[PDB]
């Protein structure tokens, strides 16, 4: 077992998030520095997020070791993720939510039912806190519990493109992102993010309280912004290149506006409707936690 650092597991260098920028390693924040926005006539107002359902998927026993980290990251950032809403994994996550479970969350992000001492794992109280919310990813597809797939993206845009004044105001002009870019920059970035050990991020997001959680939110705001960026490219209506002075600038219109696009395209990853449900639910939970 790994004891959680007072700053959270993300303080550990083992869980550091990084993205190649035209193939060289870089912190997400300094990729976000390359981003630039051209505002348009439309506006994003942020409606309040409906509070997530109290209900959890039944903590049913399942054979095998669920790979929950890869499931979430693939559902959010992977190329053509499949079976994103298959219930079993999440039932196991709910089993992690239980007060005295034998289940463990390995730092691999695999969920083990047995207490396998050879494999290091996150502190059970912390994963209980994390699963207690995130198992609700399990009812992403049930009609009773589907998250808004449209309005939530306002928040995404606000947390990505939004200037501190706009984030205070809660409204921003709908924006067209752009950055000097290499071939396949959005796919490569998405690959760089899908490899992230995000369970440390979410576990810290749930278990941490007071000053520690706030310092975590400031230290990690750019990470969350990179995740939001990958999602936004997945849902942006249109993505193109612009040749300028022998440099291609990638352009994504528009940030904060979910187009509900489902057909795959070269430029970016793509959400099938099931992926859309999943991401919407994930955003509901994650923003509900981030804004508190």
């Amino acid at each position: 077992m790994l004891q959680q650092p007072t700053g959270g597991y993300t303080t550990l260098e083992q869980f550091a998030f990084t993205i190649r920028n035209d193939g060289t390693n870089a912190t997400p924040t300094q990729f976000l520095q390359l981003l630039s926005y051209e505002a348009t006539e439309n506006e994003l107002v942020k409606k309040t997020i409906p509070t997530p359902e109290t209900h959890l998927p039944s903590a049913r026993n399942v054979p095998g070791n669920v790979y929950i980290e890869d499931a979430i990251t693939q559902a959010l950032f992977g190329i053509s993720a499949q079976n994103v809403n298959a219930h079993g994994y999440f039932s196991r996550l709910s089993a992690l939510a239980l007060p005295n479970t034998s289940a463990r969350l390995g730092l691999d992000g695999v969920i083990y039912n047995s207490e396998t001492i050879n494999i290091p794992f996150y502190d059970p109280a912390a994963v209980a806190n994390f699963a207690a919310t995130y198992a609700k990813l399990g009812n992403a597809s049930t009609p009773r519990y589907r998250a808004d797939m449209i309005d939530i993206y306002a928040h995404v845009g606000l947390e990505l493109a939004g200037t501190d004044a706009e984030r205070a105001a809660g409204v921003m002009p709908v924006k067209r992102a752009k950055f000097d870019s290499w071939e396949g920059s959005l796919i490569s970035l998405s690959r760089d993010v899908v490899n992230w050990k995000i369970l440390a991020f979410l576990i810290d997001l749930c278990s941490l309280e007071g000053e520690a959680l706030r310092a975590f939110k400031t230290r990690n705001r750019d990470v969350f912004r990179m995740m939001l960026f990958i999602m936004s490219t997945a849902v942006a209506a249109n993505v193109v290149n612009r040749k300028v002075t022998k440099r291609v600038d990638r352009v994504l219109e528009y940030i904060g506006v979910n187009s509900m696009r489902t057909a795959g395209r070269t430029a970016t990853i793509t959400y099938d409707l099931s992926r859309h449900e999943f991401a919407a639910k994930f955003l509901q939970l994650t923003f509900t936690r981030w804004n508190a």
């Binding site: 057909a263 795959g264 395209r265 070269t266």
Partner: protein, 50 residues
């Protein structure tokens, strides 16, 4: 849904139609034929005998 083909190049095509219009006398007739066939296919008008 992706169609694995090149985009219809509006600009290049219009430029080439201009070039052909300036150099290829048959062009007019070609386009007309298309239109003619279309009218014929729409069955909008036929000559009656009387």
């Amino acid at each position: 849904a992706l169609r694995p083909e090149l985009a219809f190049d509006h600009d290049h095509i219009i430029r080439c139609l201009m070039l052909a219009a300036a150099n290829y006398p048959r062009l007019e007739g070609i386009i007309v034929q298309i239109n003619t066939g279309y009218v014929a296919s729409a069955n909008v008008i036929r000559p009656v005998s009387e």
